[PDB]
Amino acid sequence: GKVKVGVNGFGRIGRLVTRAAFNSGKVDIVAINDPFIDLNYMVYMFQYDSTHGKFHGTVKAENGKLVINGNPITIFQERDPSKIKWGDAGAEYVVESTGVFTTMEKAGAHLQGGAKRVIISAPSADAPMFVMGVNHEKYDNSLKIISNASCTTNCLAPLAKVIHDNFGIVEGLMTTVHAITATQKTVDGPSGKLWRDGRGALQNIIPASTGAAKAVGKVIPELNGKLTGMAFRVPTANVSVVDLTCRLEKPAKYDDIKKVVKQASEGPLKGILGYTEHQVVSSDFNSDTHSSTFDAGAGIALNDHFVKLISWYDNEFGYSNRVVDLMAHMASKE
Amino acid sequence: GKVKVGVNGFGRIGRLVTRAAFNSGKVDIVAINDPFIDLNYMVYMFQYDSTHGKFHGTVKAENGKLVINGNPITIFQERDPSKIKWGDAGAEYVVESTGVFTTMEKAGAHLQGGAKRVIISAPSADAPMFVMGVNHEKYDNSLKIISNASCTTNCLAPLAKVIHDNFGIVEGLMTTVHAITATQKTVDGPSGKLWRDGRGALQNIIPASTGAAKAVGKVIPELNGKLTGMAFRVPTANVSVVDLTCRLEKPAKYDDIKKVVKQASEGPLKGILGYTEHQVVSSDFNSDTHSSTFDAGAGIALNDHFVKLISWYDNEFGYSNRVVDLMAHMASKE
Amino acid sequence: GKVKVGVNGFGRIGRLVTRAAFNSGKVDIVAINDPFIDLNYMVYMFQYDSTHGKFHGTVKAENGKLVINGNPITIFQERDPSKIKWGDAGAEYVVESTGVFTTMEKAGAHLQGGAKRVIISAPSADAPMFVMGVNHEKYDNSLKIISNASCTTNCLAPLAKVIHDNFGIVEGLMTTVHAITATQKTVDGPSGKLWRDGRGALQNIIPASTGAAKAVGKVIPELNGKLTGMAFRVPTANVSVVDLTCRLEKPAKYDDIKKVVKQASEGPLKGILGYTEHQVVSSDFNSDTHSSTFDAGAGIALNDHFVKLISWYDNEFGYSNRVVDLMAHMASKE
Amino acid sequence: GKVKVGVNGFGRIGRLVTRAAFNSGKVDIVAINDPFIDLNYMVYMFQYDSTHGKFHGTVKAENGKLVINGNPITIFQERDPSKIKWGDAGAEYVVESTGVFTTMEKAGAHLQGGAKRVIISAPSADAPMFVMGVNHEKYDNSLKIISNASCTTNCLAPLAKVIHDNFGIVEGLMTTVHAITATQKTVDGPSGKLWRDGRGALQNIIPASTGAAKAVGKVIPELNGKLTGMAFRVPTANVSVVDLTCRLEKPAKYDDIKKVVKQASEGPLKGILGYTEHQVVSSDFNSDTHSSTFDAGAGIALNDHFVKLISWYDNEFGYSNRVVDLMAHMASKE
């Protein structure tokens, strides 16, 4: 149901979760905290988007509040999350989207300000992790601090679930060809901890490490220790693709894989896992809200036990909608 | 002393084979045929290159000849390859680089004009196929029409050879993240036979088919039927990467894989297979003449029998230098 | 009672005129001719668009007809325009969008098949030229073959009209920073007539010639011989900008220029000439149907008689909508 | 011997000035200060460059010193510029390249550590500004703190000097189509002071303000108040172009403009101002050390008194070489 939500951070994830909330109408955004972006600039950042276009609606600054579609939103400018007066603003759930308070200890600071539950929109080292359609039924009311995993884990886990349930994944190695992100540089610049990530994003294919495939073993415990992978950052603004190479236990002809994935996309994973037989390219998934879309034509099987499965994901819009979906699911269990 | 070479086609491959021949000095280009590009335009196309820079030397049109570094080259403008007077121009070997005469029957037309041997700089449905460092010792003087396989086969085969020789490849699936090519479109355009390839190259990650992994099974017969793969075209002008996910027969710790690849790069495959432990990105391989460069840091192993190996290749420069190397080898056997 | 339209050519202009016709609902597309693109491929090309997104509606092939939003469209595959049965399909006006039948003689072939009028969606060497909001009132029922000028002319002419009407343009020089087009190459390739245009579109800023400023003197005869310009093609998939540097007769303070442009955008040029004071960038105009949008903030004046005026244009959508608007106007005059 | 130089900051300008110093051999780099980049990372950042390629020479860390081509360089890590012991390291001139100490008061801090002169590699609000080939002869030994102006001012001023000296510039408006810079963002992000500059660099043409044309009026006093302009940032990694639209006092034919520019490029402005009649595109100027290269073919004249002149500049390499040249000139006057 329509729970009141607070968003910590108005960066790429925070703005798109706010966007998804107003577009879907599943939740009500009532407060936003950002100590670095003032109200007039938030109006501009929310109104215009290079990737997803101008917001379909109205965005104004009125009496110190951000008014989206006539709905006023309280704006906070606190650096310390324990100082945010979430309860005063009426925010029941808080989306922790800054990327710097991902442990339960750090994310728990929001409970001090009056928030009832915290949803970390990033992987967490210790919080319970969820992927809608995969393990969201393991959520219960005793859980006050949870994580929605990453955009990549949300793409891989629904597909891994269907393949493992039907044929059994003996082992798998994944590659994600990922669009550019805010942490990258326009030209060769400093990135002290991750040297390759400092190289010009526009000119390069950049290998990167990702714990997304390993994280699938947390949301699907039977796949713990059976998956790992890496990423390549390429010069596209949005939409990424997962390439899963795996060994199956039971033999599976490629048409049998297509059949079970199509069945899952039409039934229990409708809206989360998509299925296509069309000649799609990455831009066909811009602003697509699925977590994962299986590309039947792009995948290839060496034999009945060794296949490469391809799945597209709008790394911005799929994930943002899953955060709203997770919160709406949580509200139904209150 | 060096073999005199004729080049059919002054497209991307033809110009870069000509550049490799003058840069390496291993062979002498004496004739070029192109029915659509006149002498003045050939000077311009060879002199300036967006990817590899201005040619390191002199290029001018003098008395109807293309003069590169003081060497005059006879220019032909024939549409029918059987009409090119290669013998008159002194061209002993002909590089068939147009991409439209890839069968032994079609490529054989150059023998009518006086050429002694033909090297198809592309895969052929029936010509004997070679990869330098892998099976070039299987070449013999009776072979008048041969193929140098594709750029991607030249990246995968040297790495597959080392891995198979030391550990044994039970099976493998490859993905190549490939730079854009001349067959792609700037904006969504017609590509009747391959619909995805007509979509805008600048805006998209495009899945594509490739027979390069399967072709490794022809150059390394022990791997016949054991490898397959696909490609993703991404918006970079040059430099591609191979991602080989394979299952090994003998156990191999990742440090053992690094050791054998490094050994091969320093010895028998020197200049063909490279090895790096540096934090490299694609642009670090621009104008690199190796067929394949193993990126030790980028690869990942799930266990001692299931690994993902990463190898970079300048899809233009590496291959064009191998065409010149193959010719130099053929000349030594005359 | 909307006019029934036939579209010759399903290239980027033809598809976008069809998309504009269904989106605006001003005209009814009843027939499309393209000898190289079959019905199944037309569904794909219309449905998916890298730049403007998936078509918002339904598009399917049903009993040899292209059905868009339940409206069946007859499909022809004729190479000779005089052989197209436009009359049998019910097409009253024909949009000549192939770019190869731009003279009165060539475009007139469509009248043989039963079309009543022909609108060339490109500049013509001899047909009367129109720009909506500038000289569309000079159209009369005796004109069976007309031209809608080019996208750059449709951007410059509405702005030049307002400036000349209020202050008088003594002389002007225009630069257009233009997005990439279908005539460009992905990598350095052959472009025999225009050498710079063959260079890789993704890697370069390419200077190019344009007769668009000179052609403003044909639609606004008072400006004949007073304007010229050039273009720079840059690696963006869509949206271009005009930069008009002109010498004014009457003194014009920058706030007076803003006032008259804003007035025109709200009144007679509503929908054609836009006006903004927002901090916009090119993506803010993606799928914007205006011919020209004056950017108040980007412009600069040296003195009251020498200014640089900036106007954005979606080179694809704005022009397409003007083709539809021109045909709707012609229909009102029947 | 050659003057010994210290470089404050190892960002894009600092590294490329160091690269220019070793490549040209005009000055000796003996010390570098950067409080955020450690020695091992400096080796990596200097050795590999996506834009200009791997450094032509040797670079290694040895005994806490950066050794380039056998020359050891002392490395400092000071946040306060008054604390850098330039005198101890033997640094006579200091290049202030951080972009944050551009006033004479702030840049003067380097004199406290023992530096004799400071060259600000950026525009300064109060320091004397110089452009090589334009006003470098106005430098004298009493000037301890000077500025080398900006990369755009160094492109425009040599061309403006030739045009004004021969024909007289009554007034001029400039546009620079500029490659992407380190201050831009990969995806829509925060840029509080300049909102348009925070928009995604890969997806957009971004209008920007520049004082570069106005600054030409300081280096060439008889052009004060006669020039202004603006910029468009476009998605290319390097090389930019100046488009000068100017009114001339003495009416000149375009061939007369070509003649005087060619003459200047062959004589007094040799190596500073280039001249070409070739069909060049931006990539043809990658790693070109000229400040400005007049493109004869790209420019357009409306009449004998109103012209648009085009000049290319490698915004990275041209400017860095002028910093070195300015210091070599200062050394000759000691």
Residue numbers in the entry:
A (entry chain D), B (entry chain G), C (entry chain F), D (entry chain B): 2 to 335
Can you list sentences taken from the study reporting this PDB entry?
The GAPDH-catalysed forward reaction occurs at an important transition point in glycolysis between the enzymatic steps that consume and generate ATP. HsGAPDH was purified from the supernatant of HEK293F cells treated with the mannosidase inhibitors kifunensine and kept for 4 days at 37°C after transfection with a DNA plasmid for recombinant expression of an endoplasmic reticulum glycoprotein. A fraction of the molecules shows Cys-S-sulfonic acid instead of Cys in the active site. GAPDH allostery is mediated by intra-dimer contacts (the active site of one dimer subunit is in close proximity to residues in the neighbouring subunit).
HsGAPDH crystal structures carrying a Cysteine-S-sulfonic acid modification of the catalytic cysteine Cys152. The protein sample from which crystal forms C and D were grown was analysed by mass spectrometry. The crystallisation conditions do not nominally contain redox active ingredients but crystal forms A,B grow at pH 8.5, while forms C,D grow at pH 6.5.
